[PDB]
Amino acid sequence: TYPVVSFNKTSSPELKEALETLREKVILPTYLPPELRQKIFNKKYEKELAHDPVTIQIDGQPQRFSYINMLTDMPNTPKNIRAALLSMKNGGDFANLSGLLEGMHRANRKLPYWLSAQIVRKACKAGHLQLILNMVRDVKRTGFTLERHETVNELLFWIQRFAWKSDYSEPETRKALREVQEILDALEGDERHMSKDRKRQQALTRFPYHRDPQFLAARLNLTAELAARRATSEQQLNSANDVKNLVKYAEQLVRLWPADKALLDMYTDEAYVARVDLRYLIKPQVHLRYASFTLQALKNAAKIVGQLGHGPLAAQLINRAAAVEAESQLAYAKVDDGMAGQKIYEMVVGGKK
Amino acid sequence: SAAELAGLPPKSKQESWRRKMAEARRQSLEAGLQGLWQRKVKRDQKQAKESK
Amino acid sequence: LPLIPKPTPFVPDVPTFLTLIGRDLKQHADKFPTWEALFTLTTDQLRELGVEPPRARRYLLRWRQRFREGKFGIGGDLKHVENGVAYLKIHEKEASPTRTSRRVVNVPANQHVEEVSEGERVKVKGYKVKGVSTIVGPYALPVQKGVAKLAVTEGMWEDKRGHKVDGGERRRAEVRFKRGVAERKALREKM
Amino acid sequence: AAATKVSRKMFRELHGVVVTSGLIDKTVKVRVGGQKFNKFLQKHFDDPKQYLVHDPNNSLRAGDVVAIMPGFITSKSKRHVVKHIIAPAGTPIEERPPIPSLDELWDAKDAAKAAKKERKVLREKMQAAEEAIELAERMARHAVREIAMREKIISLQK
Amino acid sequence: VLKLRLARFGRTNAPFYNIVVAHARTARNSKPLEVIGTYDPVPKKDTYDTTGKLHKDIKLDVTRAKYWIGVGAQPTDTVWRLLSLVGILDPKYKKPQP
RNA sequence: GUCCAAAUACUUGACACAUGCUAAUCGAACGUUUAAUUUUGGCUCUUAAUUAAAAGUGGUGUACAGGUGAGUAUAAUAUUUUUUCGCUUAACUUAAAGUGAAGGCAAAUCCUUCAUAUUGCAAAAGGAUAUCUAUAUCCGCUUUAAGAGGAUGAGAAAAGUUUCAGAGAUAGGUAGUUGUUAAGGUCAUGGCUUAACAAGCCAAUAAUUCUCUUAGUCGAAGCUGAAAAGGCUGAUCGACCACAUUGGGAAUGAAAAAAUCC
RNA sequence: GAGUGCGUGCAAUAAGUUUGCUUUUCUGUUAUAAGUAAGUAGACAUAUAGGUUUAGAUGUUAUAAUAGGAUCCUUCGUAUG
Ligand SMILES: [K+]
Ligand SMILES: [Mg+2]
Ligand SMILES: [Mg+2]
Ligand SMILES: [Mg+2]
Ligand SMILES: [Mg+2]
Ligand SMILES: [Mg+2]
Ligand SMILES: [Mg+2]
Ligand SMILES: [Mg+2]
Ligand SMILES: [Mg+2]
Ligand SMILES: [Mg+2]
Ligand SMILES: [Mg+2]
Ligand SMILES: [Mg+2]
Ligand SMILES: [Mg+2]
Ligand SMILES: [Mg+2]
Structure with a gap:
């Protein structure tokens, strides 16, 4: 069905070393039938393979497969992925994650739960957001499921940051708001993103990802940045239309989000205990990271909704913002000078720049 | 059925049909066994009566 | 005695009915002068008109009796049809603060789902929402995100007759073998 | 109940x-x-x-x-x-x-057969106990390792 | 699978049936396990009757048919229709009232 | 030799066969491809889907129905009567409990395997349709306890029954074979099984074995006689047996009971 | 002299097949070994981070014993002489 995994673009030589190792011993063997794949890892057939090694009609050229000691010759998949990941400083380099995670999905390699959040961080800080959303869209092949609650909170963060970087320009904001809805529709509709781990995290938070106030607040941010610009008939229709979605989403977030409850109190108190789910939020360095856009959203949202003549919502949204701002200010007094969280929050909410 | 001995209504359309067909087979077996039993008794008496 | 059912919006006239049920029954669309002649004519009368073979006459009488009982095929419960083309749309709701019930309803092409009243929106049977903006169901071609249409096609409601691939279970090896022989001869002749 | 008597x-x-x-x-x-x-x-x-x-x-x-x-x-x-x-x-x-007499010959069968069942119930129980011991002995070697390994982790959480 | 079905007999253009209890996968007219009764499709007319009514003669052993129905016998669509009239089973089909 | 209806119609070469047909079906098991349709991404190519066709993987059925009479010479672990019984994981009725977790093929209700299921061995599979401003049903799957059915175990005990083709030759046959002791096995009985002893058991008028010739067997099923345990036939009807060009064979399955398979 | 759908002996023999001092291989528990691959369990630390490190309780790999099923040879074995 799909083309065989291949890597033909590597800027540094160390990168190629990590990929060629996995490709020839962890990904390529999977393309063999169940019969032959059991011969490579057998000592009884070592003597035979040395004479007539196995071959496959890959792109015409016949491949080769000799004996491979399962205990010694096999490489360490986590380390190799980490080495390959750190050695990525080019567009063509990060384009290999689509093939890398594909082969790992074929090899049934249970990668670290936190790996998804790491790939989204390094790949997005270099300007390769589309290569990520392409994998999330092509989940049937790359296996880049949105399992972790952090991966969803890490991805939505960058989507908002890319738009915020250019002062929320209409051309990109219109495109950025499409990507957010592309995810919220995938978490609900698409079934590839549903797994046992996600069933546990949702049970602790009592909110499904597509109805989690932490994620919905991202959709309310970009929306609030569309009505602020305008509030030419074709363009005037979109502005008036966005005012309906704002009051619609703003009225939905207040319902789910309880009263006077900050980010660390939204979910149940039993979720912040386990480290395999919803514990990154405890560290102030990470809290300020996801508490900046969600905070600025409520402020900018409560403002517009106040101009339209909605008293209740104005007081409601300001209630949450005051609760998150107070909690956010606390974390700002404990974060170490130089950490990413202190810089992001200082640039977004503080507006220093 | 346990759901029938408790006096509960049928779950769906099919459950009601099965309840009726099962009873039709329950009453038919009773009237069949008893009906055929009287035939044998009435037949054995005639033979013994005449043979006597 | 012979009650006649009212024409529905999806099946307004006879040519539409005979087209849906397929089986090449649209030949005799002219035999029936009106809609009331289809459900009135008898077996013997249809035999005099020319409705043959008997398989087509007995098959038409079946879909005839099946129409009186409201046992329509697919897309028969539609109400908002325009020139044999319908339009489906998704109607979202809020069953709970964390769930959403989506139903494939039938509304005019121009009007929006929420704008239509409760009694005007009709839920079509056999069509569901797989996901959040995809309409799944037989003969549901997509028009937009969350919008599909139903075009009146031939054989839409027909009961497909079985066929044999290459003579069935008994005479199958014999058919394939001869076909192969002809191909090889042609290739040798061509070379 | 468990003994089968001849027709007699x-x-x-x-x-x-x-x-x-x-x-x-x-x-x-x-x-x-x-x-x-x-x-x-x-x-x-x-x-x-x-x-x-x-x-x-x-x-x-x-x-x-x-x-x-x-x-x-x-x-x-x-x-x-x-x-x-x-x-x-x-x-x-x-x-x-x-x-x-036929009674003496029939009684010999009942007695001979009854004693045969006594050996079966005895040999059967011995085979079950002789096997349950070997089965429970595996739990000892299997439970001692688990208790010795499960207590090592619990002791490291106090 | 025990079935209560009709074994067709008679001559050309003169059908006469035989209600029997036979195995499903067996010839239609093979010797069955039992013969519950007979059935004549062509309706008759009373001898000295000019009203125009018609009736159908059906001989049936109800007591024997009930036992077989109670142990899992599956009567065909036609035999089921007859047993419904007798009151042993419920009608499988009904005329739509609407 | 005018007409009508019903019923019969290759009795011979089981000789050779042109052509069309006699077993297929389920999309509510499953994905694969090709078409348009609508969405992505990057500037025709490339994602993710919907839909319809066309070939397939799976489940059940081709173990029923229908045809023929070549071969086939019988007393057999065959058959009734009464007493006592046993087995049955498919399908059909009644009900209960359980229907979770991975891997392999493109995918699966297909293969492989795990957890759980009185004590310990021993199972399963999912698919589909509604309701509300997740819940409840539907068709299946696994196991267990019964009824029914059964082609079932060598069932057994007692007393009976079975007109076994024609012609010829053959006096030995039987080796766990016959019995005793002990033990196992079995619902129970039986060298059924094993160990150690004993030399027995069946038959003598052919038990046993062999050659030749001929034949599907049987029925008030057909014909016939006043009648005989009548005679003859063995078409149409029903039951049984065998075979599917000839010869030699195995597996699957609850069960070979196939026009299958080698 | 010619023929033979018969019986039978020997040789030979495809499918199939008894047996095991035949040859390979898979699976199952049982007892060990390893923890470098896969995993599965922890213990510490880091922060545009997610590293270091030990561990075998299920499980993976290896050896041995043992049970079983597939292959090769063997035996029997149509045609054929
Ligand atoms: K003939
Ligand atoms: Mg047959
Ligand atoms: Mg005959
Ligand atoms: Mg399940
Ligand atoms: Mg007597
Ligand atoms: Mg013997
Ligand atoms: Mg005398
Ligand atoms: Mg003959
Ligand atoms: Mg014959
Ligand atoms: Mg020889
Ligand atoms: Mg030889
Ligand atoms: Mg390791
Ligand atoms: Mg040798
Ligand atoms: Mg020979």
């Missing part, structure tokens, strides 16, 4: 003559009478038959008249048992070992 049912008695004896232990060939009806000729023909009768105490000599009974299964080809001696041959009846 009485059957017909036949008068015959011991044709052979002393060839096989506790067995004699007795010749009894019969009559088979021919349906074509409408005539009865003598149809004598010779069976292998069970002699428990070897108290029968070839030539004496005896009374046998069927339904006493003792071997593959033996289905008759001696009831009593009609007319002895050679020596009087009082100079031969007594013929056990």
Whole structure:
């Protein structure tokens, strides 16, 4: 069905070393039938393979497969992925994650739960957001499921940051708001993103990802940045239309989000205990990271909704913002000078720049 | 059925049909066994009566 | 005695009915002068008109009796049809603060789902929402995100007759073998 | 309840003559009478038959008249048992070992069979205990490792 | 699978049936396990009757058919229709009232 | 030799066969491809889907129905009567409990395997349709306890029954074969099984074995006689047996009971 | 002299097949070994981070014993002489 995994673009030589190792011993063997794949890892057939090694009609050229000691010759998949990941400083380099995670999905390699959040961080800080959303869209092949609650909170963060970087320009904001809805529709509709781990995290938070106030607040941010610009008939229709979605989403977030409850109190108190789910939020360095856009959203949202003549919502949204701002200010007094969280929050909410 | 001995209504359309067909087979077996039993008794008496 | 059912919006006239049920029954669309002649004519009368073979006459009488009982095929419960083309749309709701019930309803092409009243929106049977903006169901071609249409096609409601691939279970090896022989001869002749 | 008792049912008695004896232990060939009806000729023909009768105490000599009974299964080809001696041959009846009554022969089967079941229930229980010990012994080596490994982790959380 | 079905007999253009209890996968006219009764499709007319009514003669052993129905016998569509009239089973089909 | 209806119609070469047909079906098991349709991404190519066709993987059925009479010479672990019984994981009725977790193929209700299921061995599979401003049903799957059915175990015990083709030759056959003791096995009985002893058991008028010739067997099923345990036939009807060019064979399955398979 | 759908002996023999001092291989528990691959369990630390490190309780790999099923040879074995 799909083309065989291949890597033909590597800027540094160390990168190629990590990929060629996995490709020839962890990904390529999977393309063999169940019969032959059991011969490579057998000592009884070592003597035979040395004479007539196995071959496959890959792109015409016949491949080769000799004996491979399962205990010694096999490489360490986590380390190799980490080495390959750190050695990525080019567009063509990060384009290999689509093939890398594909082969790992074929090899049934249970990668670290936190790996998804790491790939989204390094790949997005270099300007390769589309290569990520392409994998999330092509989940049937790359296996880049949105399992972790952090991966969803890490991805939505960058989507908002890319738009915020250019002062929320209409051309990109219109495109950025499409990507957010592309995810919220995938978490609900698409079934590839549903797994046992996600069933546990949702049970602790009592909110499904597509109805989690932490994620919905991202959709309310970009929306609030569309009505602020305008509030030419074709363009005037979109502005008036966005005012309906704002009051619609703003009225939905207040319902789910309880009263006077900050980010660390939204979910149940039993979720912040386990480290395999919803514990990154405890560290102030990470809290300020996801508490900046969600905070600025409520402020900018409560403002517009106040101009339209909605008293209740104005007081409601300001209630949450005051609760998150107070909690956010606390974390700002404990974060170490130089950490990413202190810089992001200082640039977004503080507006220093 | 346990759901029938408790006096509960049928779950769906099919459950009601099965309840009726099962009873039709329950009453038919009773009237069949008893009906055929009287035939044998009435037949054995005639033979013994005449043979006597 | 012979009650006649009212024409529905999806099946307004006879040519539409005979087209849906397929089986090449649209030949005799002219035999029936009106809609009331289809459900009135008898077996013997249809035999005099020319409705043959008997398989087509007995098959038409079946879909005839099946129409009186409201046992329509697919897309028969539609109400908002325009020139044999319908339009489906998704109607979202809020069953709970964390769930959403989506139903494939039938509304005019121009009007929006929420704008239509409760009694005007009709839920079509056999069509569901797989996901959040995809309409799944037989003969549901997509028009937009969350919008599909139903075009009146031939054989839409027909009961497909079985066929044999290459003579069935008994005479199958014999058919394939001869076909192969002809191909090889042609290739040798061509070379 | 668990012991199966013989039928202890009485059957017909036949008068015959011991044709052979002393060839096989506790067995004699007795010749009894019969009559088979021919349906074509409408005539009865003598149809004598010779069976292998069970002699428990070897108290029968070839030539004496005896009374046998069927339904006493003792071997593959033996289905008759001696009831009593009609007319002895050679020596009087009082100079031969007594013929056990059918009750004595039936009781031997019940007792012999009952004791057989006693060995089964005993050998069965021993086989179960001899196997449950080997099965529970694995739990010891398997539980000691788990308890020794599970206690190591718990002790590191205090 | 025990079935209560009709074994067709008679001559050309003169059908006469035989209600029987036979195995499903067996010839239609093979010797069955039992013969519950007979059935004549062509309706008759009373001898000295000019009203125009018609009736159908059906001989059936109800007591024997009930036992077989109670042990899992599956009557065909036609035999089921007859048993419904007798009151042993419920109608499988009904005329739509609407 | 005018007409009508019903019923019969290769009795011979089981000789050779042109052509069309006699077993297929389920999309509410499953994905694969090709078409348009609508969405992505990057500037025709490339994602993710919907829909319809066309070949397939799976489940059940081709173990029923229908045809023929070549071969086939019989007393057999065959058959009724009464007493006592046993087995049955498919399908059909009644009900209960359980229907979770991975891997392999493109995918699966297909293969492989795990957890759980009185004590310990021993199972399963999912698919589909509604309701509300997740819940409840539907068609299946696994196991267990019964009824029914059964082609079932060598069932057994007692007393009976079975007109076994024609012609010729053959006096030995039987080796766990016959019995005893002990033990196992079995619902129970039986060298059924094993160990150690004993030399027995069946038959003598052919038990046993062999050659030749001929034949599907049977029924008030057909014909016939006043009648005989009548005679003859063995078409149409029903039951049984065998075979599917000839010869030699195995597996699957609850069960070979196939026009299958080698 | 010609023929033979018969019986039978020997040789030979495809499918199939008894047996095991035949040859390979898979699976199952049982007892060990390893923890470098896969995993599965922790213990510490880091922060545009997610590293270091030990561990075998299920499980993976290896050896041995043992049970079983597939392959090769063997035996029997149509045609054929
Ligand atoms: K013939
Ligand atoms: Mg005399
Ligand atoms: Mg057949
Ligand atoms: Mg015949
Ligand atoms: Mg399940
Ligand atoms: Mg008697
Ligand atoms: Mg023997
Ligand atoms: Mg013949
Ligand atoms: Mg014959
Ligand atoms: Mg030889
Ligand atoms: Mg040889
Ligand atoms: Mg390791
Ligand atoms: Mg040798
Ligand atoms: Mg030969």
